[PDB]
Structures are given as C-alpha cells and as structure tokens.
C-alpha cells in the first residue's frame, strides 16, 4: 500500500539508480521502473556485525565513509560544470566592464 | 593523410584578447559567432511563428476550457501555480482540522 | 613483432567478453550475487528453426 | 551479510529476483528456517500478526537449472502447480529449489540411484512434503511404474552417455502430451572423443527422433564450460 | 531564454497561449504550516539528491558519447554505401553491355 | 457467426453476414461517421451529384482536346466547383474525376466549416451547437447541419448575438461589453 | 485527332500510350489485366476462342 | 568604429572598403563620423560585439 | 401507425413495425425487447431473417437489414420499393415485392 | 430530455470485432553467439568432419567424376561423414528419372543420413537452419544463393566442386 511505498520510496530510488552509486561497478542496462508488488527482505547469514546491520540501504550507504567523499566530490564538479557560464559568469563580465 | 606530412598538418593555435582591451572579456572567434547567430535565428523563428498565430487568431474561437481558464486585467493568462488538481481555497472544516 | 601480437591478443580476448559470455573458471569464493544485474525480459537462447 | 534487498518476481512463475547492489536469484522456502546446502536466505515480513516467510538463494554455479534460468530461457515448464519428474536428483540441491518453484500444490518426483544421496533425499523430503524420493535406476522405468503417473515436466540432469534413451523411456511412460522436457547435457561426459557442438547436435537429433520436439538450447557459458540445456515439448504425434 | 512579448502573448489563440505563472509574494498559510524534518533527514535528502544528480549527469554523458559514436560511423557508412552503390551501377551497365 | 471450424470455413467461403459486396465497403457509413452526418440518405444524395459531375467530365473529356466547347465547359465546371468549395484547386482537369468526392462535398458542410474555423471543438459539438441554434451566417440563423457553406459565404459564419457562447468567450478574454447585449 | 469523338478517342489514346510505353517500361507492369475471376475469365477465353 | 584612422581625411580616403571582425562578420566602411576625428560608421552582416576587433587587410 | 406484426419461425420473438416509424424486436413471453428503433420514415413490413438475430425492414423505399440490437447492417440498393418481405429459411433467400412490379430474391448468406 | 446531434447506429467497420479484419484485438530474444566460435574462427570443429551435402553438390560431383568420400578426404585431408538430409534426398527423388544415377549414388552405405522434421522438402532452408543452429557442420554446396547465405553467416565452412576436385572456403586449417 501507499503507506509502505512512502516509507521505502528511497532505497527503491537507489536500486533504480544503482549505476551511480559506485564508480567501479557498471551494471547492465535495464530501466527498472518500480514493480506493482514487491517485498523488502533482510539477508539471513547462517551460522557485517550487529553494530552495522541497518534498516535501509540508504543508511548503509550514508554510514559508509569514502562513498560520501566520492558523492561530494562528483557532485561539486557536476555543480561547477553546471554553473559554468550562466549568470554569475555573466554578471562578473558586466561588472568587469563597469569597474574601469 | 595520404600525401600529407605530419609536419604539414600541424596545429595552428589561436590568439587571445588584447591586453589593453581586456575588460570586454573573451575576444570571440568564428565558432563563438555561429553559436551566437544561430541561437538568435531560432528564437526569431519561433517569435515569427507566434506573431503569425496572433494575426490569424479568429476571434469566434470556442474551446470549452475557457470556462475554467481565466484571463487577468492585463490580458495575459492566469496559471494557478498550485496544481489544478488541488483546490486553492481550503474550506472551513479543512482549516479547522489543519489548525 | 611478438609483443605486437602479445597485445592484439589481449585486446582480442577482452573484446570476446563483449560478444559471448566467456567461461571465467567457475565460482571464485562465496557466491555474492550476479554483480551486474539480472534481466528478466531478455532471453539469450537459440530457438530451433 | 545483513543488507536489505527487495524481492520482485521473475518472468517465470515461481522464481523471484532479489535486487540490491548485486541482485540474486531467489525462490520461496517450502521448509523455512533451515538451509538445504548452506545458501544464504532472505527473510521478508509478510503482513493477525505479520508472518516472517522467507526466501532462499539459487546459486547458479551449483545448479544447472539456475544457470539456465539466469542465462535466460524462454520457457521453463516448471510452474507453481506442476508435477515434475526430476531424473538424476544428485542430492537435494537443485531438487529443493525445483520443489519450491513447484509449490505446495504440485509434486516433484526425485529419482536417484545411489544410496547415500538417497538417504539425503529422504531426510530432505520429510520437511519438503511434496518431494517424493524414488531410489531406483532411471534406465528401467518399469520398476517405479507403480509409484508415479503423468508428470507435467521431466527435468533430466543425469550424467550418462545413454542420456537421451533414458529420457525417452521415462517420457514415453510418464510424460503427458505437450508436456515439458528439460535436458542438461554435459558434453565431456557424453563423449570426449568429439567436440561439444557435435555431441549437442547428436543429442538434439536423438530427442527429435524420440519425438521430443526441441524448442530451445542454451550453453550456460559463464557458469559451466561445455554444458547445455535443451528444452523441448513431448509432441507425441507429429513434430511437424 | 525566449522572451515573447506581452502584446503578442495576450493576442495568441486559445491553444497557443503561454502558461506563465507568477511568483508568490505572500507568505501563505500552507507554506508556513508545512513541516520539514531535520538532522538525519536533511542529510538523507542531500544524499538522495547527490545520487540522483550524479546519475543524471552520468546518463547524459553516456548518451552524448553514444551520439558521437553513431554520427561518426554514420559518416563512414555513408562512404561505404556510396562505394557499393557505385560498383552496383557499373556492374549493371556491364551486364547490359554483355547482354 | 460461430467462428467456423476448418472444414466449414473451406466449405462455405463466401458466407459473410455483415459485409456484402453491394455495400461497397460501408463507405456511406464510414464517411458519414467521419463527418457526423445526421440522416442516412445524405451520402447518397451527394453521391448522385458526384456521379453527375464525373459523368459530365467523362463525356466532356471524350471530345477532341483542342475544341473550345470542351475547354470552355471544363473551365466553367472547374471554377464552379472551386467557388463552391467542393474542389480545392482548379489546376488540372483530372481533379474533375479523381478528386470530386462525397467527402469533399461533406467537408464543405456547415459543422465542418465550424470545426475548421475553430468555432467548435469537434464536428459533433458543432452539430450540437447549430441544432441548439447559436450559429448564423450573415444575418439569418441557420438551424440544420446540412447547410453547404461556399467559399464566399464562409466569411460570414459567426455566432448569433446574445448567445451564451459568445458571452463566454468575450468574458474569457474579459472584453465583455454588456452595452450591446454581449 | 481534333476530329475523333468519344469511344474511338479514348481507345485510340489508350492504344497509343500503351504502344509508346512498352519500349522502356517493364513487361510485367505495362500490361495489367483486369481482375477477373477464374470461372468467368476461363469462360470468356473459351467462348472467344470458339 | 573607434581608432584605426586618425582623421576624417583618412576615413574619406578609405570609404567603402570592406572590413571584417575577427569573428568573420563581414562589413563595410560607410561614412566618416563628424565629431570625433578618427571614428567612422560601418555596417556589418549582423550585430557585432564590443569584444571584437575590426580589420582592414591592405597591401 | 398501424402495426405490422411478424413472429419468428419458432414462437420466441416478435417484430412489430409501425407505419410511421417504429420497429421493435422483442421476446414477447419474456419482457425482453432487444431492438427498438424509430426510423423516422414510413416503414411498411418487416421479417426476421434466419433467427432473432437479423431482421429486414421495408422502409420508405430501400429495404434495410438490422442486426439483433438494431444496428444497421445493410441498405439494399436494389429492392427499390418493397412493401412485402418474406424469407425462405431453408434456402436463405429474402424475397421482396412491392410498388415496382418486380419480385426480387436476395441470398442472405453470401449477399 | 432528448439528446443532441442524434445519429443512426450503423456497423463500425473500423471497430466492430465481428468482422474479419478486426479479429486481432515482453520477452526479447537475442540469440547468444556460439561458444564454438572465436571471432570468426570456429575454433571447436576438429576431424572427423561432418559434411552436409545437397543436390547440386551431388550432381556436380557426378558431372565431374569426383567420388564423394574420397573427394572429401582429398580436399580436407581428414576423415568425413557425408550426410544427406531427408529433404535433400526428397529433392533428388523429385528431380526425376533423368537423375537415377545421382539417386543411387546418394544411396550409398558410406553416406550417413539425418532425418529432418519439418513440413515440405526445401533443402536450402533445412541446411541453413541446422547449420546456424549448431556450428559444427561443413556445408557442401554449389548453389549461388546457398553459397552466399553460408558465406555470410560466421564460422561455417563451405565445400564446393570447382574444377576437377573439391575446394573448401572458410576452413582455416587445410594444410
Ligand atoms: Zn530438411
């Protein structure tokens, strides 16, 4: 129901966007729109410790450390290509004219 | 290359804006000019299309959605920025419950 | 002329993993998963006639 | 290890895919809470209390039908109400996974010749109540002609060079018309004197001579070397 | 962007009118009511954003590189199809000289 | 009627209870479905007229290609149908046999002229609006959907004044002047 | 021509156009026969040969 | 155009010439301006920018 | 107007044909009417064809053939002015005579 | 109380499912490349070869007087199982009694014979289907069309009567 889909709408985003999570993994191409029926599951190891078993994929990815460094680096350079010549650039050119 | 030396197809580098004229930044060359000119040309082409439609308007035009859509005092269109799947004014029982 | 053909063979069996799915040597350790995805729409088998 | 995955169904009915950052092939568990060969299990909490039913991973390096399924076959004939005759139930590794593809309303007849694998089969078929272990040589089907009748599919993972004759006998006896036939061929086990495509062509020719029309074959190449799976339907009257 | 004038876009037909919604000047009630969670939830929101923008930039990069791939083999395949067509239209003429 | 088995389908091949040969492929039904023609004999009353134009163009092409009676009458018929709107252009004379067509005479009707003038949203709503009596050509109100609106006379298709539809489009653009009733 | 009235005119023109067309046009496509059913085209041919 | 000449006599000497910017926008010297001495009016293919350098190739 | 009444060949269905415009095919011993159509021209006679599934009406001039729920299936270009319809049910022939002095048989299966 | 824009109801030949043209109200399949193949090599086939013959190979071998088994052994310098499918044999039997020599030279004890299970007797589609199925055969032929099909698909060698003994085309180890 929607009361569960609004809970797990985030790790479904990560399973949809797996190919961005890790620069060395490179999944094979499917789209994977969210299925109508699914079920969240936890892997039972038979006889990661108890300190680091979580309740989302998202919490595992956030509790990881060098992945957050990679996401911050890649986001910042995506940002500084996206902001490259648009409007702070344009007014720095106009005020470079108006200075002298 | 077939009958061309590697010392024949060398790379002629390009020049910069003058040091005196440096506040008008980036002396632009022909690739930058065609990036300028073809963008102005496509924006003029869609502006010419919209002026053609405004001339050929036919003011006895009747679509049924002009019972919901409405036009402001300047003549332009009012687009309700929230939705049009939700109602803008929430009634008094709704405001009772939200408050 | 030997190390040329040493390397245009290493390119060659790297391109071969793009057409076929080359037998790597079996399961390495514990089975982790498919590691690249399971596609349930695609069926890569030879139908008969 | 302890990660969270989402279970989603496959194209085949009865088998599921477990998506995470590396997705698994998964089936339901007919005997929950115990692993048949030490494979890792996944435990959803299906919503009266919410019951913890659980799912079991199908390792394709240890299972030829899993290798065929995730290499991608068009039509398995193993489905959630079926009666399957598994020939060469080596122990219950793939037979457990076939059993809970088949479900509680269907039957899996697991035929095995060797006795210590037979003991493993009976100690598994107690807690999977739809596996009928039959310890008998599969080359003489008139022996267990009294115990089985009219299966819907015939899986065959025997390792014998008279494979197609064994399959022809059991299919003529117990498989119904347009029933399914799945063959696992191991080329170096059939005969090492020829090449693998020659022996695959010869065994497929033998199948269509015993009027199992072959639909499909798959080489299952990153998992086994020089194996194959041939799917066919037992046409019984006019392959044409 | 394209800035289409007021004197045109108030005289456009009913199908072609431009839906341009005005900004909100007033701090409205639902905007000042609605609640945003903080701390762990704001870093979850930031993380989902960072994943989704790296995914979108990766996909855009991959599709532009695929465009550059198939444009170049399109050019070389135009060379090959013209070559084969020329040999075709000479072999046909040679066939009709022989017959 | 029961999706005949194979020996039946072989034994009775010409049996068809819906599509017959004299129906001509149900084109009466099909173009009257396209242009929302109200009563059943309008297609065939237009078809008599297309038959008369095509008969005359046949007999008039059978004359020698140079003689002025042929040339004059083909040009008179061609200008007549173009000014009636049945033809789209008077360029070639094979339009008198190829492109005169009951669907052309139907596209020249009044609800279809309404729809192509954007005065309604569809041909069914144009039929509803002029059955409801909103549409006049010139000064006088037109009430039947079969009216044929020639090339000069489609500059005068308007709504009537005091119509609620004229009121609502003027007040959509909030140009409604209640002085002159609308 | 400039004096040949109707049916002789149409068939004279059709004859001339077929004769000029047969040089360069394909033999399979210049002479298309009318779609006549089998039991009445065979009947037409049998009576015409009689 | 500001300074490639020093006076209206020089621009009068060079009226009607073809100039171009560095961006390939062609153009032509139209008339010597009056009020500043070495300035002139030129008409180009389309709107040149302030960051450009006009050019008169001569031998 | 005056209603021309026709039954089916078994007793199951009834088909009435008003002289002004009103045709109706009904189950007369259930209460089930399965076609009712007001063809605004002066209809004369009507018959079923081979079932309750198709019925032929002799309208102002042209004879029409409607299906079970009343949709028009055919407009007979011949049968110029029918007044009397009939059906030969072993031979599948709709027979027609009227104000022309002509008797026409229309094979209903092939058409 | 009545509706506007009233129409008669007539049968809708675009949408009515009761009539013949309107009677017709995923899983992709990319066949995997054969594991027998390298890029274009077919590294898997090794002697004794299995050589699928067709009818004009038989007729050209009789018209040139090359024996079947000895000509194949001379061409490949290996051993051979020449194979006649049932459609090739049916094509030879259909060719008439002007080819009785070819028929009783194809009925030979040394020439083994497959049994194709498909309707009709079209040898070129039978040979092409069972050769791109399996990539373990040699196709011996002399049809221009069949030779062009077979030399377009990869990893399938091709024997043909040319001159006064057999020639072999896409086999890379003949000497
Ligand atoms: Zn065959």
Curated annotation (Swiss-Prot), chain B:
Organism for this UniProt entry: Saccharomyces cerevisiae (strain ATCC 204508 / S288c)
Coiled coil start-end: none
This protein's gene is called UTP11
Region described as Disordered: spans on this chain: 1-22
Q: What is this protein called?
A: U3 small nucleolar RNA-associated protein 11
Composition bias, kind Basic and acidic residues: at what positions? 1-9
Q: What is the similarity comment for this entry? A: Belongs to the UTP11 family.
Q: What does this protein do?
A: Involved in nucleolar processing of pre-18S ribosomal RNA.
Q: Where in the cell is it found?
A: Nucleus, Nucleolus
Assembly? Component of the ribosomal small subunit (SSU) processome composed of at least 40 protein subunits and snoRNA U3. Interacts with snoRNA U3. Interacts with EBP2, FAF1, MPP10, RPS16A and RRP14.
Judging by the UniProt lineage, the source's domain of life is Eukaryota
UniProtKB/Swiss-Prot annotation, chain C:
* Highest taxon of the lineage: Eukaryota
User: Compositional bias (Basic residues) at which positions?
Assistant: 1-18
Location(s) in or outside the cell: Nucleus, Nucleolus
What job does the chain carry out? Primarily required at the G2/M phase. Essential for viability: involved in nucleolar processing of pre-18S ribosomal RNA as part of the ribosomal small subunit (SSU) processome.
Q: Assembly and partners?
A: Interacts with snoRNA U3. Interacts with MPP10. Component of the ribosomal small subunit (SSU) processome composed of at least 40 protein subunits and snoRNA U3.
Family per record: Belongs to the SAS10 family.
Any extra detail in the entry? When overexpressed, has a role in the structure of silenced chromatin. Overproduction causes derepression of gene expression at both HML and HMR, as well as at the rDNA locus and at telomeres.
Protein name per its UniProtKB record? Something about silencing protein 10
- Source lineage: Eukaryota, Fungi, Dikarya, Ascomycota, Saccharomycotina
Q: Which residues of the full protein are shown?
A: 561 to 609 of 610
Curated annotation (Swiss-Prot), chain F:
Q: Which Gene Ontology MF annotations are present? A: RNA folding chaperone; rRNA binding; snoRNA binding
Q: One Pfam family this chain carries? A: S4
Which keywords accompany this UniProt record? Nucleus, Ribonucleoprotein, Ribosome biogenesis, RNA-binding, rRNA processing, rRNA-binding
CDD domains linked to this entry: S4
Residues in S4 RNA-binding domain copies:
108-174
Give GO cellular component annotations, separated by semicolons. Answer: 90S preribosome; Mpp10 complex; nucleolus; nucleoplasm; small-subunit processome
Q: Where in the cell is it found?
A: Nucleus, Nucleolus
BP terms from Gene Ontology = maturation of SSU-rRNA; ribosomal small subunit biogenesis; rRNA processing
Provide the family line. Belongs to the universal ribosomal protein uS4 family.
* Subunit text: Component of a heterotrimeric complex containing IMP3, IMP4 and MPP10. Interacts with MPP10. Component of the ribosomal small subunit (SSU) processome composed of at least 40 protein subunits and snoRNA U3.
Q: What does this protein do?
A: Required for the early cleavages at sites A0, A1 and A2 during 18S ribosomal pre-RNA processing.
Listed name of the protein: U3 small nucleolar ribonucleoprotein protein IMP3
**Can you name the source organism?**
Saccharomyces cerevisiae (strain ATCC 204508 / S288c) (Baker's yeast)
Swiss-Prot record, chain J:
User: Which stretches make up the PINc domain?
Assistant: 49-148
* Origin superkingdom: Eukaryota
Q: Cellular component terms, GO, for this chain's entry?
A: nucleolus; nucleoplasm; small-subunit processome
Q: Which SMART domains match?
A: PINc
ATP-binding recorded as keyword: no
For the biological process aspect of GO, one term held by this record is: maturation of SSU-rRNA
> What does the UniProt function comment say about this protein?
Essential protein involved in pre-rRNA processing and 40S ribosomal subunit assembly. Required for the early cleavage steps of 35S rRNA at the A(0), A(1), and A(2) sites.
Q: What is this protein called?
A: rRNA-processing protein FCF1
Please name the taxonomic classification of the source: Eukaryota, Fungi, Dikarya, Ascomycota, Saccharomycotina
């Amino acid at each position: 129901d929607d009361n569960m889909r609004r809970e797990v709408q985030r790790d479904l985003l990560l399973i949809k966007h797996r190919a961005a999570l890790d620069p060395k993994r490179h999944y094979k191409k499917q789209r994977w729109e969210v299925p109508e029926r699914f079920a969240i599951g936890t892997i039972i190891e038979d006889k990661m410790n108890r300190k680091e078993r979580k309740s989302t994929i998202l919490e595992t990815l956030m509790g990881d450390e060098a992945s957050n460094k990679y996401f911050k680096r890649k986001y910042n350079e995506i940002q500084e290509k996206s902001t490259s010549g648009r409007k702070a650039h344009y007014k720095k050119m106009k005020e470079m004219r108006k200075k002298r | 290359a077939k009958l061309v030396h590697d010392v024949q197809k060398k790379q002629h580098r390009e020049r910069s804006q003058l040091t005196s004229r440096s506040r008008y930044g980036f002396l632009e060359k022909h690739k930058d000019y065609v990036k300028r000119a073809q963008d102005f040309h496509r924006k003029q082409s869609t502006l010419k299309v919209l002026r053609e439609k405004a001339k050929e308007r036919n003011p006895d035009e009747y679509y049924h959605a002009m019972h919901s859509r409405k036009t402001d005092a300047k003549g332009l269109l009012i687009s309700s920025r929230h939705g049009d799947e939700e109602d803008e004014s929430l009634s008094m029982d709704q405001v009772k419950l939200l408050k | 002329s030997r190390v040329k053909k040493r390397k245009k063979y290493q390119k060659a069996q790297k391109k071969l993993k793009s057409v076929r799915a080359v037998y790597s040597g079996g399961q390495s350790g514990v089975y982790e998963g498919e590691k690249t995805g399971i596609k349930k729409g695609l069926t890569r088998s030879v139908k008969f006639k | 290890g302890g990660a969270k995955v989402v279970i989603e169904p496959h194209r085949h009915a009865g088998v599921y895919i477990a998506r995470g950052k590396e997705d698994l092939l998964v089936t339901k568990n007919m005997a929950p809470g115990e692993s048949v060969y030490g494979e890792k299990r996944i435990s959803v909490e299906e919503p009266v209390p919410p019951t913890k039913v659980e799912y079991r991973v199908w390792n394709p390096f240890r299972s030829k039908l899993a290798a065929g399924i995730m290499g991608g076959l068009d039509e398995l004939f193993i489905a959630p109400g079926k009666k399957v005759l598994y020939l060469g139930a080596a122990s219950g590794t793939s037979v457990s996974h076939v059993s809970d593809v088949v479900g509680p309303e269907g039957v899996v007849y697991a035929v095995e010749f060797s006795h210590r694998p037979g003991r493993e089969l009976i100690s598994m078929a107690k807690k999977r109540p739809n596996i009928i272990p039959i310890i008998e040589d599969a080359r003489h089907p008139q022996k267990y002609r009294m115990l089985i009748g009219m299966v819907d599919c015939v899986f065959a993972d025997v390792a014998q060079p008279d494979q197609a004759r064994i399959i022809a006998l059991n299919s003529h006896m117990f498989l119904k018309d347009q029933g399914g036939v799945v063959i696992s061929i191991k080329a170096n086990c059939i005969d090492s004197t020829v090449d693998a495509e020659t022996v695959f062509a010869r065994e497929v020719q033998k199948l269509r001579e015993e009027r199992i029309k072959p639909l499909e074959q798959l080489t299952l190449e990153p998992y086994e070397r020089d194996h194959c799976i041939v799917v066919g339907r037992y046409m019984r009257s006019g392959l044409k | 962007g394209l800035k289409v004038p007021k004197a045109v876009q108030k005289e456009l037909p009913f199908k072609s009118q431009i839906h341009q919604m005005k900004p909100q000047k007033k701090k409205t009630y639902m905007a000042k009511r609605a609640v945003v969670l903080g701390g762990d939830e704001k870093k979850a929101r930031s993380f989902i954003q960072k994943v989704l923008t790296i995914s979108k930039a990766k996909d855009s990069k991959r599709k532009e590189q695929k465009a550059s791939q198939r444009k170049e083999r399109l050019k070389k395949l135009a060379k090959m199809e013209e070559e084969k067509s020329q040999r075709d239209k000479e072999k046909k003429k040679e066939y009709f000289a022989q017959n | 009627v029961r999706k005949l088995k194979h020996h039946e389908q072989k034994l009775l091949k010409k049996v068809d209870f819906l599509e017959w040969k004299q129906d001509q492929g149900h084109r009466d039904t099909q173009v009257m479905r396209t242009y929302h023609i109200q009563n059943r004999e309008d297609y065939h009353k237009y078809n008599r007229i297309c038959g008369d134009i095509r008969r005359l163009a046949n007999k008039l092409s059978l004359l020698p290609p140079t003689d002025p009676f042929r040339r004059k009458h083909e040009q008179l018929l061609l200008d007549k149908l173009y000014a009636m709107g049945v033809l789209t252009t008077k360029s070639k004379i094979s339009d008198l046999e190829n492109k005169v067509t009951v669907s052309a005479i139907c596209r020249r009707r009044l609800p279809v002229i309404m729809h192509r003038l954007k005065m309604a949203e569809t041909i069914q709503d144009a039929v509803k609006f002029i059955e409801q009596g909103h549409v006049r050509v010139g000064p006088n109100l037109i009430n039947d959907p079969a009216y044929l609106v020639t090339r000069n006379m489609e500059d005068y298709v308007t709504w009537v004044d005091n119509s609620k539809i004229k009121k609502t489009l003027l007040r959509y653009r909030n140009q409604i002047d209640d002085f002159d009733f609308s | 021509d400039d004096q040949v009235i109707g049916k002789a005119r149409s068939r004279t023109l059709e004859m001339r156009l077929n004769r000029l067309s047969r040089v360069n046009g394909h033999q399979d496509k210049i002479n298309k026969l009318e779609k006549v059913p089998m039991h009445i085209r065979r009947g037409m041919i049998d009576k015409h040969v009689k | 155009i500001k300074d490639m000449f020093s006076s209206a006599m020089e621009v009068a000497r060079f009226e009607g010439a073809q100039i171009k910017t560095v961006s390939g926008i062609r153009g032509e010297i139209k008339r010597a301006l009056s009020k500043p001495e070495g300035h002139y009016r030129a008409a180009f293919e389309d709107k040149i920018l302030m960051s450009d350098i006009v050019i008169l190739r001569s031998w | 107007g005056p209603y021309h009444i026709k039954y089916a060949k078994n007793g199951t269905h009834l088909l009435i044909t008003g002289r002004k415009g009103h045709v109706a095919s009904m189950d007369w011993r259930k209460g089930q009417l399965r076609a009712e159509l007001f063809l605004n021209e002066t209809c004369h006679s009507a018959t079923y064809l081979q079932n309750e599934q198709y019925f032929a009406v002799a309208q102002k001039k042209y004879t029409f053939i409607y299906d079970h729920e009343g949709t028009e299936l055919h407009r007979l270009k011949q049968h110029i002015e029918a007044r009397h319809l009939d059906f030969l049910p072993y031979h599948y022939l709709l027979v027609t005579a009227g104000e022309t002095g002509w008797l026409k048989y229309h094979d209903v299966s092939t058409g | 109380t009545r509706k506007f824009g009233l129409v008669k109801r007539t049968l809708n030949t675009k949408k009515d499912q009761r009539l013949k043209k309107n009677q017709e109200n995923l899983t992709r399949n990319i066949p995997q490349v054969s594991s027998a193949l390298f890029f274009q090599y077919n590294q898997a086939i090794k002697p004794p070869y299995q050589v699928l013959i067709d009818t004009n190979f038989i007729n050209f071998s009789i018209q040139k007087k090359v024996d079947i088994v000895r000509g194949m052994m001379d061409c490949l310098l290996a051993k051979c199982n020449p194979l006649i499918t049932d459609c090739v044999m049916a094509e030879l039997e259909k060719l008439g009694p002007k080819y009785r020599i070819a028929l009783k030279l194809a009925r030979d004890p040394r020439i083994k014979r497959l049994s194709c299970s498909h309707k009709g007797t079209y040898a070129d589609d039978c040979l092409v289907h069972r050769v791109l199925q399996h990539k373990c055969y040699i196709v011996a032929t002399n049809d221009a069309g069949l030779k062009q099909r077979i030399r377009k698909i990869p990893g399938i060698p091709l024997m043909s009567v040319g001159g006064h003994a057999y020639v072999i085309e896409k086999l890379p180890d003949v000497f």
